[PDB]
């Protein structure tokens, strides 16, 4: 259960763009500065930049 500090604009066809305050079900946070988050609103998957999200 993380929160996108800011709306992230997907940079490639592997990450999902989120908004500020949007909840993101983190998945794998060991690949590096990019973790796989799953949006529950639509139900899609997409990596995400950790600098735009925060552990609440």
């Amino acid at each position: 259960t993380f929160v996108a500090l800011y709306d992230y604009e997907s940079r490639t066809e592997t990450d999902l763009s989120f908004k500020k305050g949007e909840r993101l079900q983190i998945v794998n946070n060991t690949e590096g500065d990019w973790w796989l988050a799953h949006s529950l609103t639509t139900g899609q998957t997409g990596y995400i930049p950790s600098n735009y999200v925060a552990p609440s």
Partner: peptide
Amino acid sequence: PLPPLP
């Protein structure tokens, strides 16, 4: 390279 934070 993460993006530029707001």
